Amino acid sequence: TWRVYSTGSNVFQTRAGCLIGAEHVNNSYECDIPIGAGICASYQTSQSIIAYTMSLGAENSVAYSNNSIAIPTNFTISVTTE
Amino acid sequence: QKLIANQFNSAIGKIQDSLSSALGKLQDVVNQNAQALNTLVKQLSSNFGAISSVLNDILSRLDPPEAEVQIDRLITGRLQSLQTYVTQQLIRAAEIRASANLAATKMSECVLGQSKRVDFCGKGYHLMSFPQSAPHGVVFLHVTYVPAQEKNFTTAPAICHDGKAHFPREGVFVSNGTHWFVTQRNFYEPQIITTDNTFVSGNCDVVIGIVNNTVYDPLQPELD
Amino acid sequence: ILPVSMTKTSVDCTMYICGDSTECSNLLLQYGSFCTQLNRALTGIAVEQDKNTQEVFAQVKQIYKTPPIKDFGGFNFSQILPDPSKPSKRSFIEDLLFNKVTQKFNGLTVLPPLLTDEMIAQYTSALLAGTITSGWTFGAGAALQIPFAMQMAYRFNGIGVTQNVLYENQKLIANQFNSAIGKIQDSLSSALGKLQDVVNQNAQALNTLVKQLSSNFGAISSVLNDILSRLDPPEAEVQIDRLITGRLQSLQTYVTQQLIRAAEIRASANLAATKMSECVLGQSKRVDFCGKGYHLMSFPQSAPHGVVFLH
Numbered sequence: 001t002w003r004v005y006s007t008g009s010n011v012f013q014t015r016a017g018c019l020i021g022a023e024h025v026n027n028s029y030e031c032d033i034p035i036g037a038g039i040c041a042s043y044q045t046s047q048s049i050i051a052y053t054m055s056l057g058a059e060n061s062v063a064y065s066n067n068s069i070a071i072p073t074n075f076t077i078s079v080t081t082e
Numbered sequence: 083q084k085l086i087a088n089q090f091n092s093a094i095g096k097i098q099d100s101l102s103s104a105l106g107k108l109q110d111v112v113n114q115n116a117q118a119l120n121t122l123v124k125q126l127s128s129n130f131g132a133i134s135s136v137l138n139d140i141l142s143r144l145d146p147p148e149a150e151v152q153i154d155r156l157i158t159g160r161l162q163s164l165q166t167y168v169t170q171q172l173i174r175a176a177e178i179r180a181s182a183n184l185a186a187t188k189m190s191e192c193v194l195g196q197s198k199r200v201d202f203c204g205k206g207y208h209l210m211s212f213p214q215s216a217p218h219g220v221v222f223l224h225v226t227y228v229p230a231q232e233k234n235f236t237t238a239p240a241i242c243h244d245g246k247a248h249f250p251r252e253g254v255f256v257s258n259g260t261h262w263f264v265t266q267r268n269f270y271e272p273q274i275i276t277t278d279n280t281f282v283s284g285n286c287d288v289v290i291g292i293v294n295n296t297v298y299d300p301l302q303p304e305l306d
Numbered sequence: 307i308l309p310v311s312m313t314k315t316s317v318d319c320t321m322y323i324c325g326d327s328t329e330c331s332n333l334l335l336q337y338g339s340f341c342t343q344l345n346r347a348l349t350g351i352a353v354e355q356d357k358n359t360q361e362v363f364a365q366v367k368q369i370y371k372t373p374p375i376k377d378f379g380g381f382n383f384s385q386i387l388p389d390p391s392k393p394s395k396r397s398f399i400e401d402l403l404f405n406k407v408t409q410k411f412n413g414l415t416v417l418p419p420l421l422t423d424e425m426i427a428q429y430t431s432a433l434l435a436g437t438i439t440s441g442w443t444f445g446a447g448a449a450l451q452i453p454f455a456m457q458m459a460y461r462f463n464g465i466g467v468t469q470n471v472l473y474e475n476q477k478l479i480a481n482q483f484n485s486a487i488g489k490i491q492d493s494l495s496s497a498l499g500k501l502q503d504v505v506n507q508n509a510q511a512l513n514t515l516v517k518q519l520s521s522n523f524g525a526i527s528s529v530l531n532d533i534l535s536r537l538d539p540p541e542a543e544v545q546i547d548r549l550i551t552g553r554l555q556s557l558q559t560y561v562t563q564q565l566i567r568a569a570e571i572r573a574s575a576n577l578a579a580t581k582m583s584e585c586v587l588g589q590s591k592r593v594d595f596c597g598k599g600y601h602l603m604s605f606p607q608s609a610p611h612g613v614v615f616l617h
């Protein structure tokens with residue numbers, strides 16, 4: 001049964017077992033297809049299945065100080081479905 | 083009021099075209115129940131180790147005494163198929179019951195009220211919610227206030243004036259870099275610091291951060 | 307302490323019932339869909355564990371960072387903030403929690419969770435940094451900075467005590483807080499029975515499912531290679547069918563009880579997710595919902611398959 005995908009071309013050992021046919025990249029993105037143990041895969045790329053460690057969100061440092069406050073000067077009314 | 087009404091009317095338009103573009107939670111309970119019935123029906127054609135899965139082709143073929151042991155295998159496998167289906171329906175019904183209890187309390191607390199429970203009635207501060215009917219479900223449109231366009235200010239716990247520590251009644255003390263004001267906390271609206279938007283407690287020594295601004299008194303200017 | 311997930315176990319019912327035997331496999335086909343319906347059920351349990359974990363911890367969009375200067379008005383968070391010096395960027399109290407809590411060849415397996423413990427520690431550190439630097443504001447919209455003593459003064463107004471009662475007592479309040487955190491840290495060095503019971507129940511169930519392979523169910527032997535070695539085919543089949551029926555009933559029992567456990571873990575995860583929104587991203591007026599006494603604030607800490615709230 002199918003001798004392609006036995007190949008050494010794109011092979012990546014993961015804690016989820018052995019992944020074949022996906023290009024491992026040093027970048028991070030939001031999870032598209034979940035593989036497991038922090039790894040996800042996507043077509044985002046002349047285009048290929050990539051595999052990556054997922055990003056959890058944009059990193060942010062709050063401008064905290066013992067005498068600084070931020071106050072809103074406007075608002076948005078928003079409507080959201082559940 | 084015009085701006086708030088336009089933001090609301092615009093946001094309803096976004097819902098309307100987003101639904102015109104999903105209802106995956108309502109669809110997947112329909113899919114699960116259809117798949118379970120389709121499986122229950124398909125079990126009938128399996129043999130369970132009998133010579134066939136068709137009762138008449140047992141009965142028209144065998145003597146009754148040998149038919150009994152062939153039939154008894156079909157009884158057993160069918161009974162087990164049915165019993166499996168009913169058990170999974172009981173478990174899935176308990177999940178729908180939990181979802182209906184959530185929807186019922188969500189209607190009392192978000193539609194018949196205004197909720198202070200964070201994230202219970204959508205993201206941001208809850209204003210109100212509207213129900214819409216859906217097949218085997220409900221949709222809530224939650225309306226919320228989201229604060230926008232922050233500015234930085236310097237701030238202080240208290241003002242020291244006449245050797246007394248003054249605290250804001252509702253707001254916070256803020257400075258634009260040269261002047262001090264008191265503002266409500268969720269929307270910048272600076273006002274003159276006075277005896278009438280502050281209260282006093284003790285002298286200036288105990289509070290960790292405290293600043294020497296004046297406090298105005300609106301009953302001082304009168305001459306008689 | 308609340309459990310949030312359970313181990314993502316999975317079983318190939320064909321290898322469990324039959325091992326290598328094609329003879330057993332061709333008999334098992336006579337029972338129709340049962341082995342497909344069982345795999346569908348276990349994979350349904352498994353994807354729900356990642357959903358449970360995501361709904362508890364992934365409540366923040368930004369990964370908020372603490373400032374480098376810990377000027378929180380005398381309150382000391384060092385025991386709850388992450389240690390940068392450890393191999394895992396994990397809290398002192400989270401390391402302490404992760405120390406307290408404690409077959410494959412039969413077609414049993416364990417799938418890994420989607421988020422690692424490193425990622426769950428990242429999310430809880432972001433929730434800590436959000437609350438400590440910005441109060442409840444990061445729950446409603448953008449994080450707005452506020453000085454920590456002024457945030458605690460709002461929380462006093464929230465329980466119906468005037469702000470001056472905080473500022474006049476700030477030294478005492480910070481000392482009582484710092485001491486109470488130290489007392490938790492000592493107490494945890496002594497239990498996590500809520501989490502350990504979920505581990506024990508699942509281990510007891512897998513252990514039983516393995517033990518049932520040794521039962522003969524009235525067949526000549528429980529080793530189907532021994533049956534198939536001693537008897538010719540028409541007599542081997544009636545023996546193998548006794549093992550097939552006993553092993554099917556054993557799997558069916560196991561999968562039914564895993565569906566029932568998953569439902570109460572789902573309820574516990576929905577409670578934990580609610581409790582994070584209402585007790586961590588806000589101040590709650592619901593009596594006893596966020597610990598006993600009037601609620602000021604609370605801090606999440608990760609634990610193996612669970613969450614700990616410091617109320």
Ligand SMILES: *[C@@H]1O[C@H](CO)[C@@H](O)[C@H](O)[C@H]1NC(C)=O
Pocket residue numbers: 073074075231
């Ligand atoms: C508030 O937001 C609306 C919509 O962007 C804008 O039209 C209005 O001018 C803003 N007002 C202020 C004071 O920024």
Ligand SMILES: *[C@@H]1O[C@H](CO)[C@@H](O)[C@H](O)[C@H]1NC(C)=O
Pocket residue numbers: 063070232233234
């Ligand atoms: C507040 O001031 C800090 C320091 O200058 C800056 O990093 C931050 O972006 C400012 N925030 C706003 C809302 O202007």
Ligand SMILES: *[C@@H]1O[C@H](CO)[C@@H](O)[C@H](O)[C@H]1NC(C)=O
Pocket residue numbers: 258259260261
């Ligand atoms: C602060 O506000 C007062 C309002 O009258 C104004 O006169 C002053 O110029 C403002 N200072 C700055 C730095 O904006």
Ligand SMILES: *[C@@H]1O[C@H](CO)[C@@H](O)[C@H](O)[C@H]1NC(C)=O
Pocket residue numbers: 242294
């Ligand atoms: C505040 O005012 C009092 C009275 O003039 C003075 O003793 C004190 O040093 C002042 N403190 C500051 C920080 O200006």
